[PDB]
Amino acid sequence: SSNDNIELVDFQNIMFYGDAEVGDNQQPFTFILDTGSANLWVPSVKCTTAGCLTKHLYDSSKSRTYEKDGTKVEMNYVSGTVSGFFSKDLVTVGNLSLPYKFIEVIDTNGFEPTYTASTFDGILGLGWKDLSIGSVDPIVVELKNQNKIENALFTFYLPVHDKHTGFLTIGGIEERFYEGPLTYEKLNHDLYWQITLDAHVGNIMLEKANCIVDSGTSAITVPTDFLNKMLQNLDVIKVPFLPFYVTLCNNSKLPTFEFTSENGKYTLEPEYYLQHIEDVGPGLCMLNIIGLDFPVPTFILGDPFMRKYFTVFDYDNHSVGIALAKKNL
Amino acid sequence: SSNDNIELVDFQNIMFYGDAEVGDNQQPFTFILDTGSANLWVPSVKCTTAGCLTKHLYDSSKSRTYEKDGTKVEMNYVSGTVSGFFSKDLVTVGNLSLPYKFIEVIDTNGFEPTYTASTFDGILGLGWKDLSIGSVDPIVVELKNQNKIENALFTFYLPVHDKHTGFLTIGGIEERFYEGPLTYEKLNHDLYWQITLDAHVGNIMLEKANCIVDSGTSAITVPTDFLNKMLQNLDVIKVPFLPFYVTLCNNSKLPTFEFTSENGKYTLEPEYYLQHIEDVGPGLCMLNIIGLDFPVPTFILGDPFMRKYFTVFDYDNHSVGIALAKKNL
Ligand SMILES: COC(=O)C[C@H](O)[C@@H](NC(=O)[C@H](C)NC(=O)C[C@H](O)[C@@H](NC(=O)[C@@H](NC(=O)[C@@H](NC(=O)CC(C)C)C(C)C)C(C)C)C(F)(F)F)C(F)(F)F
Ligand SMILES: COC(=O)C[C@H](O)[C@@H](NC(=O)[C@H](C)NC(=O)C[C@H](O)[C@@H](NC(=O)[C@@H](NC(=O)[C@@H](NC(=O)CC(C)C)C(C)C)C(C)C)C(F)(F)F)C(F)(F)F
């Protein structure tokens, strides 16, 4: 130990959260720690909306370090919208802290059913400045420019359901989380953590695909046409009009995703992208895969990928490191 | 015979489609005939997306009546987006015709993976002018102004799978499609075909609910909070990651929707709204009740409702007629 950690807690097989706090009096919250966005928000005590009922709420008045701002903001996600206003106050992650600009959400009705169904309070973005609203410097970037950490990087070791918990480590790389070598891939842009890889599945290939490493996405996301050809004569049922794909867990035709570069080769075998749905039926699984088209052909390497591979997110060197995650700590 | 009858084909009691043409040659197409939108669109031959490759495409230069417009349009739906540009031509629906402004589509990826996985080419909207983009007067309104039909009204008798085909009748009500009395409900706005009903499922009551009668919605759609209360007295299986649920189709505890007004009482039993997934497991079903929040608390009575109830869409009298559909022609 030397860097600062944030324990990640598996939430009943789906998502993982981590705790951080806001205000010089602390005030704990539960966050989706999300490399796929770049704003921090937190539900306000001035929230009037149904979704806030079960949530930890933020009270600026109990904070001596609070600094009013009040500029209105709307925060858009694939899964919904959340509005409020900007504020500034001490944000604390691990036992690192800094004065930080963030959003006090007072309206969450555009974020249902997700927000009421989930136990997170807010979202802590870990992307790049250009992805943000209100041009906020990333937390880890600001910490390094204030010399509170050695390196402007952070690291994800995801929790696995029954096996172990996870860690978001800020400031340095720890050998204990991985096996074999790290391989680094340079970002094609400073926005999401997006790198370029050849994507190969069947005898289907997409050369030079834009791949986004996104901790806040619970699936592997794939281009629509690519997904469509992938499932051609696998024996997988797409329930009509739903992104709901069902197979025998044992289906011997299920392919392995292969993403390659000059530096390395990363695979995702069926065991990493399948979710058991035994309650639905015996020996049944669902593909934790969504079809999604971007302007440029794009995969999101979400949690199923990051469950297999320990990842390093390096702002200084503009790259992502990838290595096999240790099965047990 | 006397009115314009357009045959409807079933897909698995999930959705239905009907054909119509563009240009003075046939150039046939399969549409979602959709009371929940107010635009017509067809995929251009100038569309090269992977979805368009499997569809009937519209060649504007194989038809004398084409009149270019060229203006860009983004058509937005709850379930997806389609982009293209305005054009004008002869739209032939059944045995009637009219010069009509419509969208030639060149980008379909915003509506995938649904588009490619279904058999429709485009969407023919049957809503009101104010719901449209490009302020286009509805086909049926214009068809009445041109005295090609008796009444500015159309009618839906939806097909049911191993039982009968259906019909969209333009111009008048025909006794053969229903039994019992027709009951009229006034529109609360000239936008969607939206009326006001008290919605209750046994103690969960949402009085004066805004109810949209939408032929291009495959579900019953419901306020998120309302769905949560219904789920409280059920014990069904949540599909991981997705807002969908799996039941046995014969689950006796499944809710019967009740919708009352001064004028009448409408119910919808599980046998109408459930989506069978026999190919995943015997007796298995998707709930097919979908949480969806609008600015105003709203229900979408989609195909499940309209398979049970013959419906009448009356522009002249600003209302919706409802009657029990005949079980067989
Ligand atoms: C100016 O506006 C802009 O800067 C960009 C724009 O607003 C853009 N927004 C974004 O790109 C923002 C910043 N980031 C994001 O949208 C990406 C995040 O990782 C997001 N993730 C998501 O919304 C992802 N959703 C999920 O993972 C959810 N899980 C499920 O729905 C299960 C399915 C994926 C099977 C979780 C319960 C959250 C999808 C599949 C990508 C979450 F974590 F929720 F915050 C968007 F709205 F999507 F269009
Ligand atoms: C009032 O003006 C506005 O607010 C316009 C606004 O642009 C609005 N757009 C709309 O309301 C437009 C005009 N109409 C529409 O969106 C309603 C249409 O009936 C539409 N239907 C839908 O979008 C409905 N989609 C469905 O029922 C789909 N089914 C599934 O995805 C399965 C799910 C129900 C689980 C079909 C297979 C396509 C949803 C569930 C409401 C379809 F038919 F696809 F074209 C939207 F984009 F959603 F915000």
Swiss-Prot record, chains A, B:
Q: How is it modified after translation?
A: Not N-glycosylated. Proteolytically cleaved into the soluble active mature form in the digestive vacuole by cysteine protease falcipains; the process begins at the early ring stage. Proteolysis requires an acidic environment. In absence of falcipains, autoprocessing may serve as an alternate activation system.
Report the membrane topology from the UniProt record: Single-pass type II membrane protein
The annotated modulation of its activity is: Inhibited by pepstatin A.
**Active site residues according to the UniProt entry:** D34, D214
Instruction: List the keywords (alphabetical).
Output: Aspartyl protease, Disulfide bond, Hydrolase, Membrane, Protease, Signal-anchor, Transmembrane, Transmembrane helix, Vacuole, Zymogen
| The keyword Lipid metabolism is assigned to this record | no
The record's Gene Ontology cellular component field reads: cytostome; food vacuole; vacuolar lumen; vacuolar membrane
Chain ranges of the Peptidase A1 domain: 16-323
Q: What class of enzyme is it?
A: hydrolase
Query: Which compartment or compartments is the protein found in?
Result: Membrane; Vacuole lumen; Vacuole membrane
Q: What is its EC number?
A: 3.4.23.39
* GO terms for biological process, alphabetical: acquisition of nutrients from host; proteolysis
Q: Which reaction is recorded as catalysed by this protein? A: Hydrolysis of the bonds linking certain hydrophobic residues in hemoglobin or globin. Also cleaves small molecules substrates such as Ala-Leu-Glu-Arg-Thr-Phe-|-Phe(NO2)-Ser-Phe-Pro-Thr
Q: Predominant location of this chain? A: membrane
> Single GO molecular-function term?
aspartic-type endopeptidase activity
Q: Does the keyword Membrane apply?
A: yes
Q: What's this chain's function?
A: During the asexual blood stage, participates in initial cleavage of native host hemoglobin (Hb) resulting in Hb denaturation. May cleave preferentially denatured hemoglobin that has been cleaved by PMI. Digestion of host Hb is an essential step which provides the parasite with amino acids for protein synthesis, and regulates osmolarity.
Name by which UniProt lists this protein:
Plasmepsin II
